[PDB]
Motif scaffolding. Structure first.
Motif, PDB file in Angstrom:
ATOM      1  N   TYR A   1     -15.028   5.599  -6.998  1.00 48.27           N
ATOM      2  CA  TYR A   1     -15.008   4.248  -7.601  1.00 48.27           C
ATOM      3  C   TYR A   1     -15.784   3.259  -6.750  1.00 48.27           C
ATOM      4  CZ  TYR A   1     -11.390   6.462 -10.324  1.00 48.27           C
ATOM      5  OH  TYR A   1     -10.692   7.325 -11.112  1.00 48.27           O
ATOM      6  N   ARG A   2     -15.644   3.330  -5.430  1.00 53.45           N
ATOM      7  CA  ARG A   2     -16.191   2.286  -4.532  1.00 53.45           C
ATOM      8  C   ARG A   2     -16.543   2.852  -3.174  1.00 53.45           C
ATOM      9  NH1 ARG A   2     -12.905  -3.306  -4.962  1.00 53.45           N
ATOM     10  NH2 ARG A   2     -12.082  -3.011  -7.091  1.00 53.45           N
TER      11      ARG A   2
ATOM     12  N   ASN B   1     -11.467  -4.210  -0.307  1.00 51.63           N
ATOM     13  CA  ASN B   1     -12.552  -3.623  -1.127  1.00 51.63           C
ATOM     14  C   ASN B   1     -12.218  -2.145  -1.381  1.00 51.63           C
ATOM     15  OD1 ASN B   1     -14.739  -3.187  -2.630  1.00 51.63           O
ATOM     16  ND2 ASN B   1     -16.224  -3.256  -0.940  1.00 51.63           N
TER      17      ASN B   1
ATOM     18  N   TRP C   1     -13.444   4.497   3.518  1.00 50.94           N
ATOM     19  CA  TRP C   1     -13.208   3.719   2.275  1.00 50.94           C
ATOM     20  C   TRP C   1     -14.349   3.973   1.280  1.00 50.94           C
ATOM     21  CZ3 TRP C   1      -8.483   2.348   1.688  1.00 50.94           C
ATOM     22  CH2 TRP C   1      -7.716   2.034   2.811  1.00 50.94           C
TER      23      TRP C   1
ATOM     24  N   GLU D   1      -3.715   4.547  -0.793  1.00 54.74           N
ATOM     25  CA  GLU D   1      -4.071   3.546  -1.826  1.00 54.74           C
ATOM     26  C   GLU D   1      -3.769   2.172  -1.224  1.00 54.74           C
ATOM     27  OE1 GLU D   1      -3.529   2.551  -6.531  1.00 54.74           O
ATOM     28  OE2 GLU D   1      -2.357   4.194  -5.665  1.00 54.74           O
TER      29      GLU D   1
ATOM     30  N   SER E   1       0.821  -1.232   0.000  1.00 52.83           N
ATOM     31  CA  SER E   1       0.000   0.000   0.000  1.00 52.83           C
ATOM     32  C   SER E   1       0.853   1.281   0.000  1.00 52.83           C
ATOM     33  CB  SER E   1      -0.941   0.015   1.206  1.00 52.83           C
ATOM     34  OG  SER E   1      -1.843  -1.050   1.142  1.00 52.83           O
TER      35      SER E   1
ATOM     36  N   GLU F   1     -10.067   0.601  -4.435  1.00 49.36           N
ATOM     37  CA  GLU F   1      -9.257   0.895  -5.634  1.00 49.36           C
ATOM     38  C   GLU F   1      -8.941   2.385  -5.698  1.00 49.36           C
ATOM     39  OE1 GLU F   1     -11.532   1.265  -9.821  1.00 49.36           O
ATOM     40  OE2 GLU F   1     -12.563  -0.063  -8.462  1.00 49.36           O
ATOM     41  N   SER F   2      -7.767   2.688  -6.195  1.00 46.80           N
ATOM     42  CA  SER F   2      -7.260   4.054  -6.406  1.00 46.80           C
ATOM     43  C   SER F   2      -7.052   4.727  -5.035  1.00 46.80           C
ATOM     44  CB  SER F   2      -8.189   4.804  -7.333  1.00 46.80           C
ATOM     45  OG  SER F   2      -7.621   6.060  -7.682  1.00 46.80           O
TER      46      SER F   2
END
Lengths: 124, 124, 124, 124
Positions: A73-74, A39, A69, A34, A17, A41-42
């Motif tokens: 994206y997520r 779970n 988190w 990062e 990371s 990304e980016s």
């Protein structure tokens, strides 16, 4: 801050990371995280604090930061806090322990929180 | 943020500590912490993050924040991170676990970190 | 042991779990644990240790125990350790923090360990 | 037990502590612990449990044990529990997290518990 220069920059942990941080003169930590696992990304926004006037007796510099988190994206409906100390010198390190809490129902809250330990270096 | 209104304001834990926080639409937490116990007096700067778009299934809202225990009065050469979830409703609660790391020498680093749990309510 | 009598017997936590323990004069803890939650049914063997000669200054009695979550009914490939203190008197309590590690692959070991807190009482 | 042979014997952690354990076919762990650091000297009794029938999918073997820090030499009014997994093979390891609770008064109980992480190897 005493370790403002020492803390500010790019760090890498044992999972691969990437922790990108700016230390403010006033104790602020700001930057991006990062994760190489989970779970995620980016990059994700992080914020925290450090001791801008540490002991001069060879003690490390206490510090901590949080990542929620959620990014564009997520959303893992979770937050990690790292708590630890910066150790300066030739092989500078940030030694941490962390708590990862997921949003749960009340019935599942016993199972909400993971604990682990990350070590960050300037190389890797 | 879904719980921006719910999180923002004054919280009290089981020790009688006071947590004053603003939740930003963007996931930011900013405010002050006043500890009822330990090597602390008056308010300390805190920063953190929360999930501004939580699950709609009755799960809590993941969040975390950090305090470095340095202000104009004292320096405990330490940082606490709280990691936990906001649970909304009539008796809203923030249920946390926390890690308190003190700056140490390398030889004493095994003994650097306390762990505990705080529950915050809007009353008290 | 000073608290041998005080510790020995049946305890209940906030989840409705049942902790059946015998304290030996020599610091031993032996008994059974029945979890109200998780991948568990019926009783599991537990073993641990306690301070049979605690401080006489009003301090609690340090103690800990382990459960491996394998019995004749199920195997959750996991172990919980409770670490905490016995507090004697009218509302006697065992205040704990616990670590639950699941067997994982090396790639998933970051996610191996849950942390939480249980409070045990003689009633419930 | 699947890892009975693998677990039984002498282990050493990163602090230079010595963990001497026998794994029973029935999931029992029994032995002695000698700490290289803290309010400790010589060996202390330990007991714990492990998963005697682990997953056959490359997962580690969950296990835990307790030490109460009372022997014929000293009494630190404290207990450590290690929770973690055994990983077999050429460089076999026991990867742990631990909770160390000291007996405290009720007013100091917030500060009762240290958390850390130990890695045990067969060499060192």
């Amino acid at each position: 801050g005493r370790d403002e220069a020492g803390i500010t920059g790019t760090w890498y942990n044992q999972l691969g990371s990437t922790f990108i941080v700016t230390a403010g003169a006033d104790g602020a930590l700001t930057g991006t995280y990062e994760s190489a696992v989970g779970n995620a990304e980016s990059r994700y926004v992080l914020t925290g604090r450090y001791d801008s006037a540490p002991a001069t007796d060879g003690s490390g510099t206490a510090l901590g930061w949080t990542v929620a988190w959620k990014n564009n994206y997520r959303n893992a409906h979770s937050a990690t806090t790292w708590s630890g100390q910066y150790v300066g010198g030739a092989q500078a390190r940030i030694n941490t322990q962390w708590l990862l809490t997921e949003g749960t129902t009340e019935a599942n809250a016993w199972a909400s929180t993971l604990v682990g330990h990350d070590t960050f270096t300037k190389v890797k």
